[PDB]
Design a protein around this motif. Sequence first.
Motif, short mmCIF file in Angstrom:
data_model
loop_
_atom_site.label_atom_id
_atom_site.label_comp_id
_atom_site.label_asym_id
_atom_site.label_seq_id
_atom_site.Cartn_x
_atom_site.Cartn_y
_atom_site.Cartn_z
N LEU B 297 0.83 -1.24 0.00
CA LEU B 297 0.00 0.00 0.00
C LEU B 297 0.86 1.28 0.00
O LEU B 297 0.54 2.24 -0.70
CB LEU B 297 -0.94 0.00 1.20
N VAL B 298 1.96 1.27 0.76
CA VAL B 298 2.95 2.36 0.78
C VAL B 298 3.51 2.60 -0.63
O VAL B 298 3.56 3.74 -1.09
CB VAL B 298 4.12 2.11 1.79
N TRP B 299 3.95 1.54 -1.29
CA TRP B 299 4.42 1.65 -2.66
C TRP B 299 3.35 2.22 -3.59
O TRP B 299 3.64 3.00 -4.47
CB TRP B 299 4.90 0.29 -3.19
N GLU B 300 2.11 1.81 -3.36
CA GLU B 300 1.00 2.23 -4.17
C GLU B 300 0.81 3.74 -4.06
O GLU B 300 0.63 4.45 -5.08
CB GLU B 300 -0.27 1.49 -3.73
N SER B 301 0.87 4.24 -2.84
CA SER B 301 0.78 5.69 -2.61
C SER B 301 2.01 6.42 -3.16
O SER B 301 1.88 7.34 -3.97
CB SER B 301 0.56 5.99 -1.12
N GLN B 302 3.21 5.99 -2.76
CA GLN B 302 4.45 6.67 -3.13
C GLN B 302 4.56 6.90 -4.61
O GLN B 302 4.91 8.00 -5.04
CB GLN B 302 5.68 5.90 -2.66
N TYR B 303 4.24 5.86 -5.39
CA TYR B 303 4.42 5.93 -6.83
C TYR B 303 3.25 6.58 -7.56
O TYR B 303 3.26 6.63 -8.78
CB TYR B 303 4.80 4.56 -7.41
N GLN B 304 2.26 7.10 -6.82
CA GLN B 304 1.26 8.01 -7.37
C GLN B 304 1.26 9.37 -6.63
O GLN B 304 0.34 10.18 -6.78
CB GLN B 304 -0.13 7.34 -7.39
N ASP B 305 2.34 9.65 -5.89
CA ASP B 305 2.58 10.92 -5.19
C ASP B 305 3.50 11.86 -6.02
O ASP B 305 4.71 11.60 -6.15
CB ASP B 305 3.23 10.63 -3.81
N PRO B 306 2.94 12.97 -6.57
CA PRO B 306 3.78 13.86 -7.37
C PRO B 306 5.01 14.36 -6.60
O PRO B 306 6.13 14.34 -7.12
CB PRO B 306 2.84 15.02 -7.75
N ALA B 307 4.83 14.75 -5.34
CA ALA B 307 5.96 15.24 -4.55
C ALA B 307 7.08 14.21 -4.37
O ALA B 307 8.22 14.60 -4.10
CB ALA B 307 5.49 15.76 -3.21
#
Lengths: 448, 448
Positions: B297-307
């Motif tokens: 889930l962390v990877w999922e968020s991180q790799y759709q986080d522009p920042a």
Amino acid sequence: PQTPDEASLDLAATDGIRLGDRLRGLWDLRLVGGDAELPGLPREGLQLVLDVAPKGRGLIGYLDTPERLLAAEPPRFRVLGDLLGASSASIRWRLVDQASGSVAPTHDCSAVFDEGDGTLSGRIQRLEREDFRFVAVKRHFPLAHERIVLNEKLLGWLVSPQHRLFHQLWHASRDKWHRLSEKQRNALRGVGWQPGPLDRERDARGPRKDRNASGIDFFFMHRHMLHTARSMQDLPSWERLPRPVVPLEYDRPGFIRYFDNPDGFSVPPAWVAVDDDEYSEWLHGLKSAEAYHANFLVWESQYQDPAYLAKLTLGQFGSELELGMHDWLHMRWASVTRDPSMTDRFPADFAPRWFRPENDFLGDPFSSHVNPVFWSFHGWIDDRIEDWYRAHERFHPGEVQRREVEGIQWFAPGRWVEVGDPWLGPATHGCGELDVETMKLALRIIFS
Amino acid sequence: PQTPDEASLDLAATDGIRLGDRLRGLWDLRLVGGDAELPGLPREGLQLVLDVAPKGRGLIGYLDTPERLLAAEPPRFRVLGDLLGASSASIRWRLVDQASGSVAPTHDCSAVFDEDGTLSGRIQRLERSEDFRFVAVKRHFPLAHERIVLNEKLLGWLVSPQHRLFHQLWHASRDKWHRLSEKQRNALRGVGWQPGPLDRERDARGPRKDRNASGIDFFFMHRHMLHTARSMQDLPSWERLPRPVVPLEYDRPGFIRYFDNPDGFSVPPAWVAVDDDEYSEWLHGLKSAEAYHANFLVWESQYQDPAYLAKLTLGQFGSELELGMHDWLHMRWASVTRDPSMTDRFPADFAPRWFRPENDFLGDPFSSHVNPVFWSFHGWIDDRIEDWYRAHERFHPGEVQRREVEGIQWFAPGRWVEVGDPWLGPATHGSVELDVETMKLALRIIFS
Ligand SMILES: [Cu+2]
Ligand SMILES: [Cu+2]
Ligand SMILES: [Cu+2]
Ligand SMILES: [Cu+2]
């Protein structure tokens, strides 16, 4: 400085675990500033539900009107963040427009946590392409008395100094006995408050606790409190133990309800004790879903299994169950202690404020009987005595016999009932209604 | 021998975890013996569904007909048990007649493992002081390829020796390069198989892996493979990562459905490696729900986080993703290796059987691309290259320019793209029987 060679399972450590706990639940949300709007949605009366797994670092959730968050259809906005590098100073998630037919985020949220209540506040940005802000206020976790109401007469009996002090002293005496001096013991024996038979006392926590028949006292006493209480209100037993909250990812409407404590059986979230990490970690563990599946479900099984119970006398069973499962049922549905409007009440502090109906703290026998949830699980504990009788009627037919003792359905002494004289305090065992000042005094003897 | 003073959180140890995993799922069941009957239910064509929490000691489940287990209304029988001192020899649960209006158990069940195997057991009616048996066979957890069908054209490409050896060697060359001696490295160079530009090679796992531009080869080559596969078959990307199975307590049909693997995306159950506990626990971990919530889930968020993405070059992004999320995605969806009729195929073993369609093992680039789920997550990965472009298009407008490269949509060299000659083996930086032989040689040099 080299990058990692591979992944490892990176579970949340204490800070992360605690941040998740502060985020998790239902929040009331308002948009604020010049350019602050979400398509489809008003600027006020919004809600933000957030969840984080027990040792999770991902952060998920939803943003819509309250009625739409309880609805079947997809909520308008969905939350996806993580907590790496996160703290009370900076918490960031992204918003996904679920009407749009794209999972690409449409918004960048950043937040600051302040101060189960709290405040989230910060700025939003449209990623498409400005003064855009929000403020979210976490809804309180409702307490059981806000959800199960005990009637005028019953409450009167529970809150009263006669009863609170009885309950506290009954436990204190049996609980502390094995550590009390010969001087203290005689003080209590002399004032009629020794646990059980004079010079043959049945201490609840000393080295022979399983065999000395203290178990029977525990089972019987609360049965007697059950009868009295059940004559004033319909207080049904739980038949099954409440299961832990259904996570947000599987049943979103069920998750939200849980944090409103609709039935008084939701587990009040754990609190952090300041400077006491041993205690914070212990309470957290026993309130978790891991505990339900490792300990509570096991107890629920064992104490309805004939083969398990058939190995055990009544007093062995009472001891096992008081000391393991029962003490953990109390603290699992325990809510943090309150005032007439920190740290728990000292055992001998008899300030008038401590006698209010507001004081129903499950950790202290002076207060625990006031909490509604108490009657559901003492109810459940009590019904297991019947499972145990049936267990013996199967394996050891006619080796325990039913009998009326002190106006209560009970059980004659025998191979599996060690004693016929259960201890209700002085009434049954005093060799010096009840005097409030005698009780106050005996508690002072016990606590130095 | 004193009893315990108090409860502690007693999570399952290895033995009970594994025993739990053996029980979990859907079993077909028939009753055997002269007196074998359950009220309102046939003697055969029954099913038993069981669950145990990840580190649970409790055992729950249901016993009914298959259609009834999938139905909304409660099943006729509920399983309540525990695993304390259970093993393959003895496993015990009580049954509750949910039609009876009581939660008192009506049957004592007991079972043994018959050494995804088989339980032989006894049931005793709890209203007697009989020949009552059952046999239960666990249902096979279906494999991805039994549920997503790659068509004859695509499959034929993917299984062919030419492509299998290419995929293996493309990975092996870059993965081991940094550990290869200058003798091994010149042999590969002289055969056209060095990982990228001659004397400026882009090792995937060496000390300067994050910054040597290797990550771009990773992203590009699989984009190239994707474009090829997609010309022969509609292979949509996952939009969102599949969540762990829904627990049996909250959604009993959903649980059951999961073990049918209806969409090919269920996490295949972790297998015990014989005599490798380090491996056994590691595998278990990344296939767990904790792993989903802590890493995936962390990877999922991180790799759709522009920042997040806008901090990284393409070669950093690609390296971070390959070494962490991508290696773990593979093992997460892997079912055990099986010889096309236990133990893993060694790198240099080119025995004809390993080439057959049935070898679709996700753990090994020789076979991983034959697995249907390969294409679902590689598409998710490749879609994320666009989140990265938009990220730089937001924080660094104009600093990343698009370009076509070897027939594929891509990016030019710049501040955030460190090279423009992505590697695809000999075709970019160097009849079919000659090069399958070239490739076999090259693999043998590397693996000695
Ligand atoms: Cu109690
Ligand atoms: Cu009590
Ligand atoms: Cu791959
Ligand atoms: Cu590959």
